[PDB]
C-alpha cells in the first residue's frame, strides 16, 4: 500500500494518488496527472541524485511514499508511519488542508517538511508551522495578481467561487480583503462548494451565479475536480460565452478540468507559479512500462485508467504514443523540493563530516532542527535552471505566469498572456475571445 | 510533576485550560482561576462522588490522567500523545473547540471516546470527521440562531461581527452570517477577526475598525475570555462606554473574568449560555480545599498564590470564598455531567458484559472504544442539577440556552436572566437596562 526504497537517509513522500471518494468512501478515482506524474517526479529526482558523484557522494537516498487520497484525515493515518518515538524529511503534501494536518504532527517529532503545491497563507506562520517550507509562493501574492488582472480588464463587478477547506476559503478571503482596500472591484456574491456535495449541487451554484447576470467574471479557488464539475454544469445549462472564468493555480494549465469540455472553458484566464517543462522527466516517464516500473505499486491502476483497458490490455502499450501525454505543471516543483532536501543534507554533511566521503559516525542521526536550518539556507539552480530559495517563513518569491485558454481551429492550448512579479505585466495583444 | 495522576481500575483522561496562552509564541501564560481550576477540580469532585457510590460502578475505582492544554491546540496535541502508544479508555475535554478538534483527530485513530464540556463548534457534530466525539453542550448552530432572534427582537438590523482566530470564533460567526443571508432583514456591516498572536496595540486598532461603521453599534462576539477582556479594556481606554451594544456567546456567558475591574464598559451587554444551575455539592468541596488536603492538584499551589495575591506573604491559613471572592464557574455542571456520562456508559457496558459479577470480570479486562462509544450515545440519566442528559446520533445536547444582561444598580453588578431560547425565543424586554451614551459618532453614508 506504499512505495518503499531502502537507503542511508529516508525521505518521506505524500501524494494525492487517488481523489476523495463519494459521500462516505475514503479513496476514489486515481489521478493520472496530479497523482502519478508528481509521485513519479520524486522517484525520478531521487534516482538522479543517487546517480550523481558530486551531490551526496557515496550516500543513497531512500523513499517512503504514501497516498493521501485528497483527504486530510486519511493522510493523518498515513503520516503516523513516519513517527513512532527513521524519516529525516517529508516531501508534500499537495492540498493545503492535508499539508496543515501533517505539519501539526511532524513538528512534534521535529521532521522538516517541503511542499510542492500547498499555497495557503496560514502555512507561512512559523509559530504554528516552524518545520514547514515550500517551493511555491503563498496565496497572498496570487490573490493580489488576480485583483490586478481584474482591474486591467475593467471587470469591476465579480463573483467568487471557493472549495470548502483552507486553500479555497483563504484564497477568496485574501481576494476579498485586497479588493475591499482597493477601489474599483466589487463582489456580487460568494459561493462555496461543499466537501461532500449532494447530487445536483453544481447545477444550483451556476443557477445562483445567474441571479447576478451582470457579474460575468468568476474568480475561483476550487480544486481540480470541483472546477470540472462546475464547468460540466455550465455546459449542461448552455452557459457557453456568458461566464468569464478566473482560475487559480489549482486550475493552472491542467488538462483535467478542460477535458471534453473545451468550448465552455474558452477564454478562461488562469494563474500558475513560474515553471518550465523538464525534459529529463519526460524521457524517464515515457519509457515506463508495467515490467520496469515495479516500484510504483499504483502503476498497474494507472495503466488501466491511462489506456482504457483491463489487465483487454495488451501489456505493450506506450505512454506518449498510445495515449495523449503532457507533463503536469507542478512536476518541476516536486523535483526542486527533493533537491532542496538533498542540498541541505549535502551542506549539513560538508560541516559535520569535513573531507569525508560518505556518512561519518557524527552524522549517524540527522538532527531535525539543524536540518531545517540548512533547508531555509539553500541556494541552488533547480531542474529548469531557475534559482530555488526560501525566506524567513520558508516561502518562494511571488512569481507567476498568467495563461488564457484559447482555441484556434480545433487545437487547444494555455497561451502565456502575461506574468506577475510584484507588478502585473499583462500583454493584451495576445488575448483572444 | 506536570500532570495529575490518580490510579484506578479504569483510567479517564482529562484536558483542561489551567493556564491561558502566553504572549506571542510563548506556550503557557497566566493561570485561569475559573476556566481552569474550577473545571479541573469539578472532574476530580465528580470522580470522588462516583467512586464513593455503592450503586454506580460497584466495587470499581475510576482513575485519572488530567493534563493542561494551555489554551493552545499545538500544546494540547503534545499532551494528548500520552493518552496513546499502540491505558486511557475515555477522555474528558477539551474546552476550546480548536483544541478539541486537534485532539479528536488523533483520538479517533486509536479509537478513544471523547466527551467535551465546553466545545460548541458545529463541525464537531460530523460523524465522518469526528465519530468518537461527543458533548454535553449544544452546537453553535442553535446559539447563532438564538443570537439572530435576539437581534431581530431588539430591532438591531445593522450589526457587526467580532471573532477570535480559530474554529470556535470563525465558524460561530459564519453560522450567524449564513442564517442572516438565508432569511430575515438583518444586515452585516463588517466582520472583524482578533489575531491569535496579537501585537501591542492590536485591540485598540480593532475598536477603531468597528468605529468605521458608526451606525452598527451592535456587535456579535465569538471570542475567548482573554480576548473579550482586552477588547473591553481598549473600549474603556478609548472612552467608548454606551456606544457598543455587545452580544456575547457562551465564552462570555455569565463570567467574572472579562468584566472584573471593567464593570462600567460592559454595562448593557447581552450574553448567552447553555441551560445550567449552580451545584451546591461542588461548592462545599471547593471551599474546604487547602494547600494541605489538595495535594492531588499539582497546580493548586500556583492557584493559591494567584487567588489570594501572595507568594509561597501567604499565611497558609487562607480560605476560599472567605478571604477571596468566589463564584462557581458556569460550566462546572457540564464537566460533572461529562464525567457521569462516561461513568454511566461503563456501568451499562458492565451490565451486559458481566451480568452477574460485581466489579471487573474477565470479559471487562479490555474496554473496546467502539463499544463504549455506543453506550455513551445511549445514556439516559438525570445529571448533577436534576437536568436530564442525552445524546443524539451526532453526540450533541439539545439547543437550550439562557439569555443574560450585565446590569448595574448602584454598588452591585449581576448577570440578570432576561430570557431563554428553547427552539424559539422568550425575551423579556421590560427587564432590560441600558448604559448612558458618553460619545456620539455622526454618520455620512
Ligand atoms: C564508499 O563507502 C564504502 C563503505 O564505507 C567504502 O568501502 C568505499 O571506499 C567508498 N567509496 C569511495 C569512492 O570512497
Ligand atoms: C470487591 O472486590 C474484591 C476483590 O476482587 C473482593 O474480594 C470483594 O469481595 C468485592 N466486594 C464485594 C462486596 O463483592
Ligand atoms: N495550491 C493548491 C494545490 C492544488 C494542486 O495540487 O495543484 C492547495 O494549496 O491546496
Ligand atoms: N464555547 C467555547 C468554549 C468557551 C469556554 O470554555 O467557556 C469553545 O467552543 O471554544
CSV table of C-alpha atoms in Angstrom, one decimal, chain B residues 44 57 146 149 191 216 324 334 344 365 368 406 411 417:
chain,number,residue,atom,x,y,z
B,44,UNK,CA,-11.9,15.3,40.5
B,57,UNK,CA,-19.9,1.2,39.2
B,146,UNK,CA,-30.7,32.3,19.2
B,149,UNK,CA,-33.7,36.1,17.2
B,191,UNK,CA,-16.6,41.2,10.0
B,216,UNK,CA,-23.5,49.4,13.5
B,324,UNK,CA,-11.2,36.0,48.4
B,334,UNK,CA,-21.2,20.3,32.2
B,344,UNK,CA,-22.9,5.5,33.3
B,365,UNK,CA,-10.5,-6.8,31.2
B,368,UNK,CA,-13.4,-1.6,23.4
B,406,UNK,CA,-25.0,42.8,32.5
B,411,UNK,CA,-22.9,49.2,44.0
B,417,UNK,CA,-31.7,36.4,33.5
